[PDB]
């Protein structure tokens, strides 16, 4: 763990980064469906 070490840090960095962009695409498909029905909770809850 002293030798390689940092690849687990960037594995912990990219996956936390990936959960961030996963919500941002979820809120984006709540946004293009926002011109259909409601502001968020229509396309949020149906896709939740």
């Amino acid at each position: 763990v002293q030798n390689i070490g940092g690849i687990f840090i960037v594995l912990a960095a990219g996956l936390v980064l990936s959960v961030f962009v996963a919500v941002g695409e979820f809120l984006y498909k709540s946004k293009k469906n926002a011109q259909l029905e409601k502001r968020s909770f229509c396309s949020a809850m149906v896709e939740e």
Binding site: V1, I4, F8, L11, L15
Partner: protein
């Protein structure tokens, strides 16, 4: 003395050091035994 019938030399007598074999699970040695767990908890984690 007569003329020699065998040639000599002072030298050092000592034990051979034991050549302990690289036993058949030798390929696990290049990583520490916690890193093999940390890779296993990565591929059980990142897959989840």
């Amino acid at each position: 003395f007569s003329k020699p019938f065998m040639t000599l030399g002072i030298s050092i007598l000592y034990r051979k050091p034991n050549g302990t074999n690289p036993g058949v699970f030798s390929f696990l040695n290049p990583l520490s035994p916690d890193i093999w767990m940390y890779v296993l908890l990565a591929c059980l984690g990142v897959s989840c």
